[PDB]
Amino acid sequence: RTNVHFFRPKTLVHKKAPLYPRNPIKKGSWDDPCDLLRYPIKTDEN
RNA sequence: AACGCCCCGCCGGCGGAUGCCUCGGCCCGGGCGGCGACGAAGAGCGCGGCGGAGCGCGAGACGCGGUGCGGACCCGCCCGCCCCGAGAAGCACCGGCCCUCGAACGCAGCGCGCCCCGGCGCCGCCGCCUCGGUGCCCUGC
Ligand SMILES: [Mg+2]
Ligand SMILES: [Mg+2]
Ligand SMILES: [Mg+2]
Ligand SMILES: [Mg+2]
């Protein structure tokens, strides 16, 4: 023992493994490419 | 004087009483007694062919689908429907979609992380896995 300090030991850590899915159906969002673009702007400067 | 001011007989203003009318209030009785981590109540911001407030709805947005009933309209301009079903207005139930904050849950409030595969809040109960103790013992050494 080269250190005078008691530290919590190291124990095995597991990963998540749910019994049932939290999001059974994959759903879309706002980020579809065609809906992302709205419309062009039309002016003489443009 | 005459004008001005103040008092009768007609006509005009200004104002809004009165009378009549009201899809509104107030009281009494009866029923009901049903919200939420499967994300509530509340807030913000968006959504209409021409669209400000209110209602409604949520990037599937002024609504989508199913099953029954209904049977000619759709407040403006348009578009649509028209028929022994071919289907406008309406009504009931059922299935889904459901942006940001909020008990509000990776941190923070509009910015930024960890992670290796996708996901990452707290407290409790039960169960399991991996461990600590000069606690009570035991064995071997
Ligand atoms: Mg969507
Ligand atoms: Mg409005
Ligand atoms: Mg949040
Ligand atoms: Mg927070």
Side-chain angles (χ1 to χ4, degrees):
Chain A
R1 163 170 288 276
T2 63
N3 188 354
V4 78
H5 271 120
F6 177 101
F7 285 118
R8 211 189 59 223
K10 312 290 182 177
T11 53
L12 182 176
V13 168
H14 320 84
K15 313 295 202 142
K16 313 301 234 230
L19 288 205
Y20 56 90
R22 259 39 152 202
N23 293 312
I25 292 135
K26 176 76 141 213
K27 292 171 151 187
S29 115
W30 58 267
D31 83 276
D32 201 274
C34 257
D35 79 35
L36 189 148
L37 301 159
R38 302 313 292 171
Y39 47 88
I41 287 190
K42 205 231 199 323
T43 68
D44 316 271
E45 274 212 4
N46 287 347

